[PDB]
Tyrosine-protein kinase ITK/TSK (Homo sapiens), 263 residues
Amino acid sequence: KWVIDPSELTFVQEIGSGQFGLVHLGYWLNKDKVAIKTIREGAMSEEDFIEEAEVMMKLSHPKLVQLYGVCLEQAPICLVFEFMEHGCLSDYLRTQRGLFAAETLLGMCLDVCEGMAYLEEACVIHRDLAARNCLVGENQVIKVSDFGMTRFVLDDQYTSSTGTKFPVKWASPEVFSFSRYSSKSDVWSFGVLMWEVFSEGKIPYENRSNSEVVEDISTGFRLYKPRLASTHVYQIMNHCWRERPEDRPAFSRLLRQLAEIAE
Ligand SMILES: Nc1ncnc2c1ncn2[C@@H]1O[C@H](COP(=O)(O)OP(=O)(O)O)[C@@H](O)[C@H]1O
Ligand SMILES: CC(C)Oc1ccc2cccc(-n3cc(NC(N)=O)c(C(N)=O)n3)c2c1
C-alpha cells in the first residue's frame, strides 16, 4: 500500500520550507531515510490525489525521484519521498557556478531527458518541468520530481494560464494560450531547463514580465545561447522551442540525439 501510518515515520531535522509547507529529513520504518513534505490544508486537492495513488505507485525509474507514499491519518498530510542529498538542481547549479565542466552539464540534461523519456512512454505529462523541480542525488545524479502535481494545486494564480504566478517562462505557446498539455509541451519546458543547466542556474527571461515573455515568444524571440552550450547543444534547445508541438522532437528522439553528442 501507499498509505504510511504516522507510527512508521520519524522526523529528524528540518531541510527547508516549500510552497505548501515544511520539508524534513526523516526515517521510514524498515525502509530508508526519506524527505517528508508536510502539505498545508487547502493547498492541494488531497482526495483527487489519493485516487491516482494505486496507479502512480507503479512508476519507477532511476532518474525519477520516488514518492513512496502518503501519511494522511490527520491534517496536515505528509508526502514521503526518496531523499536527494544535494537538494534542488537550480540551487545546486547556482552554488557551484564556475566549477562545472561542459560534459557534466550535458550529463545533467541527459539524466533529465532519460527520466522524461520514461514518463513520455508511460503517457505521464509533467506540466511544470524546470530545474527547481529536479533534484541532485548520490554522485551528482539528476532526478525529475513533481510530475503531474499542478493538476492538484488549488491556487488558481499558479494553475491558470491567465494567472499571476503561472510558470509562463517554461510554458510552450499552446500551454500559455490554452493549457494544452502534452509530452511535446514538456519538451518545450525541457529546452528551457537545458538553458538553466548550461547557464549554471540563471533565471530565464529575468528582464521580462510574464506578458512580455508571451509577446516575445509569439514574435519568434528565443533565449540566447549560454557560453557553456556548444552550437550543437543550442540547436537541440531551439528544436524544443519550435512553435508547433508536432515539429518538436519527442523525448525518445532527444535522448538519442543528446547521447550521440555526449558519447
Ligand atoms: N526529495 C527531497 N530530498 C531532499 N531534499 C528535498 C527533497 N524535496 C525537497 N527537498 C528540499 O526541500 C526544500 C523545499 O522543497 P520544495 O518542496 O521543492 O519547495 P518548493 O515546492 O517551494 O520548491 C529545498 O531546499 C529542496 O532542496
Ligand atoms: C504515493 C504516490 C504514488 O501517490 C501519487 C498519487 C497521485 C499522483 C499524481 C501525479 C504524480 C504522482 N507521482 C509523483 C511521483 N514522484 C514525484 N517525485 O513527484 C510519483 C512516483 N510514483 O514516484 N507519482 C502521484 C503519486
